[PDB]
């Protein structure tokens, strides 16, 4: 709530929303899902991969 909402006249650099209603804005929730991208199988021979 501290970084996401900027009051009128405040620096909006790190904020998501700015406006006269900022002081009363609140996140209800945040969710994240991390997906990892990689290469599998890799063929192995007499020197390793």
């Amino acid at each position: 709530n501290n970084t996401a909402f900027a009051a009128v006249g405040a620096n909006p650099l790190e904020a998501i929303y700015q406006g006269a209603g900022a002081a009363d804005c609140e996140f209800e929730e945040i969710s994240y899902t991390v997906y990892q991208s990689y290469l599998d199988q890799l063929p192995v021979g007499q020197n390793g991969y």
């Binding site: 599998d40 199988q41 890799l42 192995v44 390793g48």
Partner: protein
């Protein structure tokens, strides 16, 4: 190149040039690099090395069994022609 007399092309860029900097130096890089994480001997795949059948042949097992049994009816006797 064309040179034209009497307006000749200066015979050089001369000594009035403005040396702008001494920043000419590339500092050699000195470094030690180590990529040493424990390696485990195995990887999992869905399938590696298989040469899957596109069609199989028809395949079978075999059996026989029984005995030699029979009910018979014969042709009647006939007059012999010749001989």
């Amino acid at each position: 190149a064309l040179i034209n007399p009497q307006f000749p092309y200066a015979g050089p860029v001369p000594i009035p040039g403005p040396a702008p900097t001494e920043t000419m130096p590339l500092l050699n890089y000195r470094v030690e690099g180590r990529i040493a994480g424990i390696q485990q001997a195995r990887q999992f795949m869905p399938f590696l090395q298989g040469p899957h059948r596109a069609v199989a042949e028809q395949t079978y097992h075999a059996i026989g069994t029984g005995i030699q049994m029979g009910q018979t009816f014969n042709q009647p006797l006939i007059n012999t022609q010749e001989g």
